[PDB]
Design a protein around this ligand. Structure first.
Ligand SMILES: CCCCCCCCCCCCC/C=C/[C@@H](O)[C@H](N)CO
Ligand SMILES: CCCCCCCCCCCCCC(=O)O
Ligand SMILES: CCCCCCCCCCCCCC(=O)O
Lengths: 58, 238, 252, 271, 59, 59, 252, 58, 60
């Protein structure tokens, strides 16, 4: 059960391969490839949206 | 490099290990096999072969072919004991030096039925009936024929068939007994008694010999390899 | 109905007027040895009705100071009729048992006994550097007794009840098959014990297997006038007894 | 995995869950829902770590002994007759069960130390040890250089210092259908002789020694032995040992109190 | 009472008062003397965390 | 292990009415109490018990 | 089975070993107020499990001379946990109750109590030209007592049992929901009372609603030796309690 | 003959791979994943079942 | 049993075929055909004596 992922390659111009050998998920290597991103939680917690090109205070 | 992690055990030399190893002589062309009679595959093939048991291993007889000869003769009494020895094949002197005993000595546990064959070497004119018996442990050893007779027995009648077989069944609480001699693992007693008597005509010897053999039955097996206590050495032979 | 009960084994029947259920071994009911589990090759004797019946041991009196009693099986039955005779003539044997402990009192009496069967109950000596002696371990069909203080003896069993003679909390004897006889509700306990051992069969003289322990956790008590003689009787029946390795009789 | 607690509400029945008869020798199967108003809880807790295997399956020192590089004949080599009763920890765990069946993983930690009559220019080459297992009956060594160390059949490990704990696996070598942790019986049918667990104990002996012969300066090495049960099966659970251990060959104990005490049945002050 | 079968017996009797306390102990199964020596307490002692409901039966 | 953070509460018992008994019957009684885990119980994190000590190898 | 019983409300369970049935109100089981029957418009609070649970009041001792006792609801519960706190913060409230009166004796004891719930039990003053005072009417969770002779007092309740404090034959208290506790057969009485009033809801401090009366019609009796301490305990649980008109707390 | 199992992962939010290299089953790693469970043997050895909501002693 | 409702007791009723003597102790009787009667609600209990003879008919 080998897993083939993608290496960090760079941008203006390849895969790896991993097999887990231990019975415990804690033994696994790092999740260095998780790129989820949601600023909205902290940057726009306002209940009434807020459009940019609009008069902020009506 | 392929990331690797060494485990306990690395670099040890365990005598019973089983790994591959480079050959010092690459491409060496061995000499063709032949086909010699008598190939052996399991030590049990050897233990299944009859060997003569030295029942008469008393004192001075132990260095004489006499150790192998059980004495039997005409008697004025009834039900006398002919011989007796315990079922301790691995450690008892009577049995431990036979093919079976020697093999048992390379192991720690054993299990199985054993066959004892008695061959009468009297003369064609002699007759007699014997009672061969095996008595599991727990009570003592039988001291009389009435006691022995209450256990596993065969009544051998001497006649054309010189030989007769007492087969000793495996009756243990364990599965395996130690070859080593433990009271926990006691195996019982084998004894023989006159059922009638050695009757012979005039001009025929009344004194006869009986030979006894041992071998394993088909349910026999040994376990746990160990070195025999039977071969010592002080320093390299030269 | 169902507190009442009737058990027939052999030519003997036991009836109970107020029981609980019947506790069964570790859920296992006794049965003869299977060819796949067997090692001794000789054909076994399975007397049946002559050996698997109810044997009633000596009674014992419960007093307000009794710490408890104990009996060791098969030992306790070594002299009971044919079961005992078969034990003598055979190297090996195995059996299960239905144990029925009896004790009726009155409604005005009170008390509560723990009735347990402890498989393999190796016991400690009173004096640390010795081994208890055969008789301190088992007096046959005669109950041995626990004590309410450290036993002293040079070869006695350390019988202080609180450690049940085994070096453990007597209050945890509960992981073993048991029932209680709380006089208020019960009057008997019935426990069926399957044969438990690390070998298919064993010699019945040199190994005990399990020990029945009766220990009062709430003492007998009553007002003056009420009868003071409250015996505890123990009736046991071997079940599925087989023997192997016939020869002459005895120990040795 | 554990049970979810199912939501329950008011009741007014003639079904009485809370009332039973413990005399039956049966443990009540009650749960909160039976005696109070419960909310639903999806329980994800697992009992993975209380599995008998995970409980026993951790290496534990069962003994250790020492021997010396030089010094002659007791000192020279050591031996141990295998048994699991000389240590408190492991022994109490195995003893929570009457019978058990399992494989073993042996690991040895071997360390060496210099002794005082030092000598100058002491510069010792690395040490290699040999451990030999002698099954019951095998010819046992009598001095560091007895013929028996040639091990043509007994298994042995040769290990050099500085290279990671030697380790092996051994099967269930018992002769019965399980290892017995208790044996309320005797070794002899007449009951004379030994009584108790020791009657069963016959697992052989370990023998250790240095391989490189004695140099100028004295050195002492200690061999720590670890046992790790694997592929475990256990029957007939028993109460955990209360009284401390006194002897390795039996259950002998000094009576001891059931628990620590407190001032009254009313004290909430945890001891 | 700790070396007596008495440690196991909760006393209860007829009284001239109402609502008297019979006993009391904390829910600290792992460390409290009342509970830590029972089958449950002994097992808890081979561990560091525990969780669950506990049943106390009174006979 | 016993932490104030992890305090678990108190178990107590009280007379709801009283032990009423007729004449010629003991007024003093005993009550036994048992413990066990319910089906949602689980332990975590293995550790050695503080309950078994030793000074040196038993012999 | 069926004399045994188990009732769970909130985090509290009651069990009975020997009851009769459970008498239910006037056949009506309690329920929250319906939109068609409602008049107060604010959204009600219906705490539930925190308020509709079993509260156990002070016990009382039955003696061979006790004429009887009585408690007034909601008053008796005005100090019980959250039920009481909700009563304080709210102008209006309504609830039903499961009342469980307990009293065990022995088999050698005898006696019989009437346990009744009298809706709207306006009581008379001992002295005709006055009105009884709040405390003569209700001592909260503490039972008031009837007397076996005309009470005198300048502001006391005319408590002579025979007229149940209401000017009627005590023997006719029977048209109200009730049960008897005849020690010979019973040991508890359980009565579920629906909310009965001429308005959908009411203030819980200025109106009492119903009074629980426990009156022995056959006196406690027993032979010497038998225990003389026979308490009567009262455990009650509000049912379907809702409140309206939240504001600051108190009476006034 | 590689065997792919599941790692202990946790619950509110993966596989391993093992190949045995020795001829003897005793050389194998632990059976840390056996979760069989039957209290009935010790918690209810009573011959006549015992229902919870029912009167224990009839 | 004609005791009173408050009395209790267990008895062992037995039958012992001939050949050996008559049982003189409970341990002797108990080894033969027996029933263990427990006094309780059912006042009565039955010991049924099986026909165990070598003949078919016995003489009166
Ligand atoms: C090259 C080194 C080889 C080492 C071999 C060691 C073999 C010994 C394994 C012993 C396992 C024993 C555990 C204990 C069992 C005892 O409790 C019982 N008394 C036996 O029934
Ligand atoms: C627990 C040790 C794991 C052993 C891993 C050995 C290398 C695996 C070979 C490739 C097999 C591919 C599919 C599986 O995985
Ligand atoms: C006895 C040593 C075993 C050698 C194992 C080498 C790694 C195996 C490669 C993967 C092969 C997958 C199927 C087989 O297994």
């Amino acid at each position: 059960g080998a897993q083939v992922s993608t290496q960090k390659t760079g941008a203006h111009e390849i895969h790896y391969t991993n097999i887990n050998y231990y019975k415990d998920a804690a033994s696994n290597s790092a999740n260095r490839q998780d790129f989820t991103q949601d600023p909205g939680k902290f940057t726009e917690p306002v209940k009434d949206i807020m459009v940019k090109s609009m008069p902020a205070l009506n | 490099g392929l990331p690797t992690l060494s485990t306990p055990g690395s670099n040890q030399f365990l005598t019973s290990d089983d790994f591959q190893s480079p050959s010092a002589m690459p491409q060496f062309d061995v000499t063709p096999e032949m086909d010699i009679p008598g190939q052996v595959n399991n030590l049990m093939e050897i233990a299944e072969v009859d060997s003569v048991v030295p029942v008469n291993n008393t004192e001075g007889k132990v260095m004489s072919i006499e150790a192998y000869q059980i004495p039997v003769q005409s008697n004025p009494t009834n039900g006398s004991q002919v011989f007796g020895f315990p079922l301790t094949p691995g450690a008892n002197s009577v049995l431990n030096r036979t093919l079976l005993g020697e093999i048992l000595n390379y192991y720690a546990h054993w299990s199985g039925s054993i066959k004892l064959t008695f061959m009468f070497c009297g003369s064609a004119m002699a007759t007699g009936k014997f009672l061969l018996a095996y008595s599991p442990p727990g009570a003592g050893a039988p001291t009389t024929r009435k006691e022995a007779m209450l256990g596993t027995h065969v009544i051998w009648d001497v006649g054309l068939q010189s030989s007769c077989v007492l087969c000793i069944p495996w009756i243990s609480q364990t599965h395996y007994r130690y070859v080593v001699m433990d009271e926990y693992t006691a195996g019982g007693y084998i004894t023989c008694w006159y059922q009638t008597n050695i009757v012979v005509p005039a001009d025929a010897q009344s004194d006869c010999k009986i030979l006894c053999f041992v071998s394993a039955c088909n349910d026999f097996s040994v376990r746990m390899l160990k070195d025999t206590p039977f071969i010592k050495q002080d320093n390299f032979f030269q | 109905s169902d507190r009442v009960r009737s058990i027939t084994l052999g030519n003997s029947t036991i009836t109970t007027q107020e029981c609980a259920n019947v506790v069964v071994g570790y859920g296992v009911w006794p049965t003869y040895l299977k060819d796949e589990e067997a090692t001794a090759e000789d054909q076994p004797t399975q007397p049946d009705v002559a050996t698997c019946r109810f044997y009633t041991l000596e009674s014992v009196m419960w007093q307000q100071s009794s710490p408890g009693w104990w009996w060791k099986f098969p030992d306790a039955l070594s002299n009971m009729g044919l079961f005992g005779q078969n034990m003598q003539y055979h190297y090996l044997g195995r059996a299960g048992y239905t144990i029925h402990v009896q004790c009726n009192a009155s409604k005005f009496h009170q008390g509560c006994l723990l009735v347990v069967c402890v498989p393999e109950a190796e016991m400690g000596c009173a004096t640390l550097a010795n081994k208890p002696d055969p008789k301190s371990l088992s007096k046959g069909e005669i109950a041995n007794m626990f004590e309410s203080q450290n036993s002293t003896g040079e070869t006695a069993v350390q019988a202080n009840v609180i450690n049940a003679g085994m070096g453990v909390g007597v209050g945890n004897l509960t992981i073993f098959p048991h029932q209680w006889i709380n006089l208020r509700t019960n009057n008997s306990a019935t426990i069926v014990m399957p044969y438990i051992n690390s070998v298919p069969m064993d010699n019945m003289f040199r190994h005990n297997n399990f020990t029945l322990m009766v220990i009062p956790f709430a003492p007998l008590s009553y007002s003056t006038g009420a009868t003071t003689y409250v015996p505890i009787t123990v009736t046991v029946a071997p079940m599925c007894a087989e023997y192997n390795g016939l020869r002459l009789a005895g120990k040795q | 995995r554990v049970a979810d607690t199912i939501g329950s509400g008011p009741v007014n029945s003639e079904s009485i869950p809370a009332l039973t008869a413990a005399e039956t020798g049966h443990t009540s199967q009650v749960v909160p829902s039976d005696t109070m108003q419960t909310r639903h809880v999806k329980n994800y807790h697992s009992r993975s770590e209380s599995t008998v295997e995970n409980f026993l399956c951790r290496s534990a020192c069962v003994f250790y002994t020492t021997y010396e590089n030089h010094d002659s004949d007791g000192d020279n080599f050591a031996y141990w007759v295998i048994n699991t009763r000389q240590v408190a920890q492991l022994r109490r765990k195995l003893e929570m069960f009457t019978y058990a069946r399992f494989d073993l993983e042996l690991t040895f930690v071997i360390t060496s130390t210099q002794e005082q009559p030092t000598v100058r220019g002491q510069d010792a080459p690395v040490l290699t040890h040999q451990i030999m297992y002698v099954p019951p009956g095998g010819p046992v060594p009598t001095k560091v250089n007895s013929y028996s160390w040639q091990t043509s059949t007994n298994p042995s490990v040769f290990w050099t210092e500085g290279s990671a704990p030697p380790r092996m696996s051994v099967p269930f070598i018992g002769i019965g259908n399980a290892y017995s942790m208790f044996y309320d019986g005797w070794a002899r049918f007449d009951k004379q002789g030994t009584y108790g667990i020791s009657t069963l104990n016959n697992m052989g002996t370990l023998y250790m020694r240095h391989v490189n012969d004695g140099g100028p300066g004295p050195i002492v090495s200690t061999v720590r032995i670890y046992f790790k049960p694997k592929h475990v099966k256990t029957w007939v659970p028993r109460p955990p040992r209360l009284c401390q251990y006194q002897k390795a060959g039996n259950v002998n104990f000094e009576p001891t109190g059931v628990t620590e005490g407190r001032t009254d049945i009313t004290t909430m002050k945890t001891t």
